[PDB]
């Protein structure tokens, strides 16, 4: 039914589950706004093929040819399923809009499903490809931030009773290479040109005059190629084509709103803002250095990473709300670390 | 069936279900009012939506012609579905009430489905946008109340047998900030709007002659225009428009109800009452400050959320009872609390 | 089936299962009572609903016509559709008993649904707003009395090898208060009034003649209307009237006896007896005041809410055994409650 | 439906299911490429089949034959089962493009059914032959690769404050023998060769004529070969062959885009590359020699197999991070090794 297809395709976790396994434990891998534009672009058009044909929308069989009187009932089936089939034959039907309208009319479900995996595609070679690597990065670059903090309490407490900076180093290491904000440019721009296309489609096939649906179809080759009781041509409309129409230009509003967000997307380094890093500089065991922003390296890929899912860190929450209430002034900062007692 | 419908949508946790993650764990995220709220106006629609197309209630199809007697069966279901897909070409038909009644009749479902992810929508952006920075920032402050609930109890002991207000700074600094409680408004507002949206078109539609969904359909384009055994048009009847229009009055009852509890939300200050913190007052770890009140700011958000979720917090139910003991004023909080011994 | 619905429906845990989440651990939350008046009252109407439309007892389409012979099937089904349709128009049909009897007959599952949603939704007010209130003072209340019962115990082993009653000024706190007690009684009460109303509408849908459900119906609107092959008017008769109306009844019958339960229900200081505290007054810990009884306050329910789910205490069923040993007198209660050594 | 075919075939976790065992606790056993040819060359053909045949795309019955008006249904229905079982009867149908197109229509889905089981064929034999072999060992070097990394943390915090290369030894065994890289290298070319014969027969069935689905059939065998009232020959048509075609057409560029694939798999040697047991060698307590490349080995494969499911090993991961440090140079190895204090 219309809402049994909308909570699977909306109101669940469609497209939204966690990966199933241990090693990414409450890492997203995925930006929120990628995981929006993802969802959106292929539950879309899948929810738009479920409601086309929906048992209540839907009044039967997709196209009607209007046999004669005369004709029996298998008859006319026969009429009915030969000119279904022949939408692909040129020379069995003549219809003024030409037969691409009709091969959009029969495969429009194909063809949304096809928009559906190509959008698919680059997220999951994201997922599958360059998601490991980032995972076991981040995770690592959590780890030692918390050691760190871990380490810079012990150190307050023992002063109130190496020392080198592998993170910042390691950071500064992905400042130059730039593989996976490449991959990630990439596959932004693969999924900006497939909605492009599936626009332009769904434009041309809401243009159409809403009258190619009904096609002239002829079953006179072979046997009854010269038999008379049967009328030289029928009239056939394709049903669910005014459907089709509507689903394609509410999926191609949506496609054109989206696109915007992929373009914004594409362009990580002025996302790049709000530095997660900056609240740990006041940290002495941690060097005040951030040295995070202006350019198309995987930095600013790792720094929206961390902006995303570094909430689930206690030692940068901790950091954060220190932070916030040096907006005061009123304390110290490291009174404050001291006090608040946060190691785990 | 109708029952199982009605189990699925009112009698089961439909959007009810709790954040599956360990991230929030015991977090509504959600006030109980916009919790309902939400729930209603989605699953609302998606009830109606179902219930209109129920085995019981549905005679059929959804469109009959009344083909002549001549007429084969698969003539007349051509007939059928040639008006059904036809409510769009206004050549084709000719209403009294025009070709917009028609549309409407035919994607009803289509309209309350549109409705209901429209009012989803606010909810999920919320919940994907502002929802994680208010859990962590509140299981923080949890956390925050719960350690001094535990030292003041320990500082008590230790006298029968830093001190910095970390959390009260934070809240202050809370008081300043307005990004949170702005998103919470914007939302609202556009959930209101929407519902107001969806009122106009269902009063729209329940406004209707009731003969609109009676229209005259001629199949006469294309070889079948000049065709004199088919008659000049023919008697279409678009069953299940009766239901339609009940069920959009119902829905038009539901979500005028509705809307003033969305306005009384907007208000939030005036529902930022019976202050949660007034209770650890009588803390002496605890300083005697709430200084949350009367404010278009985020920290009015936060007490509603602290309000609403508090009953979590072993220390804030004990010293709820210690308060709501001393309105008879017969003993003496610090030794309640001494006596009660509730650290963990 | 059948029996699959009665399976969900009386069988099964249908409104039975506990509330799904670590805060309410084996607390019901709900008296036994109110949770059977509750399970019937809601899912009867959905039982009759899906019994009214089984496979077995439903001969098939829920209205026939009898079109002429000359009429084709699918003239015949626009005839039934029609007239289904135009149960609402009341210019289409003239029959005796009216066009009320008409809309009953057709959309009598649509109020049963109603009238289960009506009745489910007090319970859900209640569960939503009052019960975590008193989960959370109720669990508060166990585990003092465990406290004291331990203490106790622990102070006659001491004496053979603070002390402030907080749980009983809790209780006189209560004793004060009435929001919960006001809550209770509205929901009972718009319960009763709901179940009144129902019982009202399904009296009159039983009284009514029988023949209701024979209605003529002309198909003479538009084209048709000065059409001659058709006849002026068809006699449609709704099947499954007979059914309705036995169903209704049984409602009727369920609904007039278990309203009393819930008037008697609505008398909770009548209902609070056979005080659950009076077994603690035998601790040399607890003071021997029990002060619970005669009064429209929160108090009363608090005694019922004890009483219903206390029996899941390991203290308050030893200090029951002693009581029922007391009986006899032949021992002694301080010497008993050493032997038994059941601190946990 | 068409979206839910999606779902479970591209959208799911169709054939990326971890072995369900506690045996490989996180190991892939099957390269990212591997895993990808095999689940496209699988599902792609079971996605097709059941496109094909989707409720939408489908007019109905997958044969008409058009029998005379005079005929009744059964006796139409007759003919078209006849026909539709006497594609295979040569003499029955007399059709231009013989009976192979006829018998291809026919057994389409059986025939993508078989290249979808061949295809998974070698993937099968592989994890049921050779997986458990790499498993074992992999696991075991994975092993003395994090205890070789705990020894020497060790000896540098004990400095700071056996000696075996039995990895090394093993993997240089592992140079000799073949007969992993044999049986992937045989699987491999199975796989190619299965895909190649595919294209060749997407390519035939699609280069057909599309109207050798219309074939001439003739129910005249046995008491019916005299018989005058039905008609020597009737015109059948298979319907969905367009369709057919169409997806055959998209499996047979599918199958070429991915064969260079299969291809590049094949050439192992070149694939191993980026050692990853470069990185290990400035640890103290393991020798200084690779001895890993340039070989039709199974040290090669189990090179790749490193590459793949090495970044699950925390000595691994800090490891290549002091690495990427080294890069800029401005510290030490053993230092950093020492502060990094990653030991588990
Ligand atoms: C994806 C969207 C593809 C839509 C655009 C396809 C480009 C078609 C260009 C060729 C057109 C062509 O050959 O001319 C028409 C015939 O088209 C044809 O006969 C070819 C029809 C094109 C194929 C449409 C079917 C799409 C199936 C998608 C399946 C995906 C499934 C994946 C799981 C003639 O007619 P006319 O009107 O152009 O001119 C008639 C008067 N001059
Ligand atoms: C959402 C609710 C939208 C309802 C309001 C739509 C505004 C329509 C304004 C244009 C009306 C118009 O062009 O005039 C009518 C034709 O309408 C048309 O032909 C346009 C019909 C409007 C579209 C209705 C279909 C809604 C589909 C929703 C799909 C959502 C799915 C999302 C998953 C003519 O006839 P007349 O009677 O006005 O005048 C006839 C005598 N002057
Ligand atoms: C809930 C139970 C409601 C039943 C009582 C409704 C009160 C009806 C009062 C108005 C009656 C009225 O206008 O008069 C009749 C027409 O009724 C009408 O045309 C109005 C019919 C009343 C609506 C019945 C449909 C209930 C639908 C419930 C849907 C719930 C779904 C929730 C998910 C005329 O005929 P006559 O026989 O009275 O006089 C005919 C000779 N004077
Ligand atoms: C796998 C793909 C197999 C396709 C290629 C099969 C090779 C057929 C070679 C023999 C052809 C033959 O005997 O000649 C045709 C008859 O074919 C026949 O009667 C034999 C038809 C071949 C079998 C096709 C059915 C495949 C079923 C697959 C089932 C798999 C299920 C596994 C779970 C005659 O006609 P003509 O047109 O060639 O010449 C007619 C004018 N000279
Ligand atoms: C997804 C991508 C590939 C879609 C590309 C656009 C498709 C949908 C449409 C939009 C405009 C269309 C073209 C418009 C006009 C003509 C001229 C005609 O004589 C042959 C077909 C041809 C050349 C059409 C082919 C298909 C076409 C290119
Ligand atoms: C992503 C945005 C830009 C998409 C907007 C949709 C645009 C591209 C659509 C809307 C209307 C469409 C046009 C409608 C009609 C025709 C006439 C036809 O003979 C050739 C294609 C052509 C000229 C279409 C090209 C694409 C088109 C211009
Ligand atoms: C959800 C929102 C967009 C719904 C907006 C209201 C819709 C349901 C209805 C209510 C009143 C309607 C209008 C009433 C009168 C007319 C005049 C007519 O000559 C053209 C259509 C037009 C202009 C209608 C368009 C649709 C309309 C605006
Ligand atoms: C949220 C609340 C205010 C909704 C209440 C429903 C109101 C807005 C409904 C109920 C009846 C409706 C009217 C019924 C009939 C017509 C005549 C038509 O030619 C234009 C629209 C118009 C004038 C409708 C406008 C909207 C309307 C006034
Ligand atoms: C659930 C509640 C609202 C049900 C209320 C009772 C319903 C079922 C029935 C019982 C008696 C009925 C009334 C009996 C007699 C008449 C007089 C007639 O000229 C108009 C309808 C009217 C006024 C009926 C309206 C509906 C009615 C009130
Ligand atoms: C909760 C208990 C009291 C319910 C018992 C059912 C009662 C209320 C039912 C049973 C028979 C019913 C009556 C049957 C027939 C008529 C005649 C009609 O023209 C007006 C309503 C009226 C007068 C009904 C009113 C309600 C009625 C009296
Ligand atoms: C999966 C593998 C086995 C498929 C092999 C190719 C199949 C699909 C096709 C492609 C070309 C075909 C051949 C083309 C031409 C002829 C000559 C004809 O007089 C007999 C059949 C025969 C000999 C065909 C047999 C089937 C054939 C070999
Ligand atoms: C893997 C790649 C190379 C596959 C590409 C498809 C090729 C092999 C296909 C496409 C068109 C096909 C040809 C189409 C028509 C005929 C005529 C027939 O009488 C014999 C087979 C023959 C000659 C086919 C052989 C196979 C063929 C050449
Ligand atoms: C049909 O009859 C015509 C008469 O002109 C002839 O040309 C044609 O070949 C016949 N077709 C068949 C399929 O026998
Ligand atoms: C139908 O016949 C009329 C006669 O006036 C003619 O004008 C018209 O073009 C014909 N239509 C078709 C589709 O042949
Ligand atoms: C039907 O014919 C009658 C004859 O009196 C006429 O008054 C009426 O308008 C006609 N109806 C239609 C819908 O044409
Ligand atoms: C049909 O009749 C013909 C007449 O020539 C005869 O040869 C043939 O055997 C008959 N077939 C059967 C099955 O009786």
């Given at each position: 039914?219309?809402?049994?297809?909308?909570?699977?395709?909306?109101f669940?976790d469609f497209?939204?589950?966690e990966?199933?396994e241990?090693?990414?434990?409450?890492?997203?891998?995925?930006?929120?706004?990628?995981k929006?534009v993802?969802?959106?672009?292929?539950?879309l058009?899948?929810?738009?093929?479920?409601?086309?044909?929906?048992?209540?929308?839907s009044?039967?069989?997709?196209?009607?040819?209007?046999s004669?009187?005369?004709?029996?009932?298998?008859?006319?089936?026969?009429?009915?399923?030969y000119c279904?089939?022949?939408?692909?034959?040129?020379?069995?039907?003549?219809?003024?809009?030409?037969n691409?309208?009709?091969?959009?009319?029969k495969?429009?479900?194909?063809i949304?499903?096809?928009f559906?995996i190509?959008?698919?595609?680059?997220?999951?070679?994201?997922?599958?490809?360059?998601?490991?690597?980032?995972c076991?990065?981040?995770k690592?670059?959590?780890?030692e931030?918390?050691?760190?903090y871990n380490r810079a309490?012990?150190?307050?407490?023992?002063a109130?009773d190496?020392?080198?900076?592998?993170?910042?180093q390691?950071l500064?290491?992905?400042?130059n290479s730039?593989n996976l904000i490449?991959?990630?440019i990439?596959?932004?721009?693969?999924?900006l040109?497939?909605?492009?296309?599936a626009?332009?489609?769904?434009?041309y096939?809401?243009?159409?005059?809403?009258?190619?649906?009904?096609?002239?179809c002829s079953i006179?080759?072979?046997?009854?190629?010269?038999?008379?009781?049967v009328?030289?041509?029928?009239?056939?409309?394709?049903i669910?084509v005014?459907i089709?129409?509507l689903?394609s230009?509410?999926?191609?509003?949506?496609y054109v709103?989206?696109?915007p967000?992929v373009?914004?997307?594409?362009?990580?380094?002025?996302?790049?803002?709000?530095?997660?890093?900056?609240?740990?500089?006041?940290?002495?065991?941690?060097?005040?250095?951030?040295?995070?922003?202006?350019?198309?390296?995987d930095?600013?890929?790792?720094?929206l990473?961390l902006?995303?899912?570094?909430?689930?860190?206690?030692?940068?929450?901790?950091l954060?709300?220190?932070?916030?209430?040096?907006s005061?002034?009123?304390?110290?900062?490291?009174?404050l670390?001291?006090?608040?007692?946060?190691?785990?």
């Open positions: 039914a219309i809402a049994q297809l909308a909570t699977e395709y909306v669940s497209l939204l589950k990966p199933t241990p090693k990414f434990k409450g890492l997203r891998l995925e930006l929120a706004v990628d929006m993802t969802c959106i672009a292929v539950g058009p899948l929810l738009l093929i479920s409601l086309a044909f929906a048992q209540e929308i009044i039967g069989t997709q196209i009607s040819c209007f004669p009187s005369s004709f029996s009932w298998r008859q006319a089936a026969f009429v009915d399923s279904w089939a022949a939408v692909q034959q040129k020379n069995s039907l003549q219809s003024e809009s030409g691409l309208p009709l091969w959009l009319h495969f429009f479900p194909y949304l499903l096809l559906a190509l959008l698919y595609l680059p997220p999951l070679f994201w997922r599958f490809a360059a998601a490991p690597h980032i076991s990065d981040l690592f670059i959590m780890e931030l918390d050691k760190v309490i012990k150190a307050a407490k023992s109130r190496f020392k080198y900076p592998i993170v910042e390691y500064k290491t992905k400042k730039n490449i991959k990630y990439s596959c932004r721009l693969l999924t040109i497939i909605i492009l296309l626009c332009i489609y769904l434009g096939y809401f243009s159409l005059s809403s009258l190619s649906d009904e096609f002239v006179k080759s072979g046997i009854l190629r010269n038999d008379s009781t009328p030289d041509q029928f009239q056939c409309k394709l669910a005014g089709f129409q689903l230009v509410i999926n191609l509003v949506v709103l989206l696109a967000v373009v914004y997307t594409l362009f990580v380094p002025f996302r790049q803002k709000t530095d997660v890093l900056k609240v740990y500089e006041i940290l002495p065991t941690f060097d005040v250095l951030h040295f995070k922003s202006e350019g198309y390296n930095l600013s890929l790792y720094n990473f902006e995303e899912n570094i909430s689930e860190v206690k030692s940068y929450k901790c954060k709300v220190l932070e916030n209430i040096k005061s002034g009123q304390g110290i900062d490291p009174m670390l001291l006090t608040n007692l946060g190691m785990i």
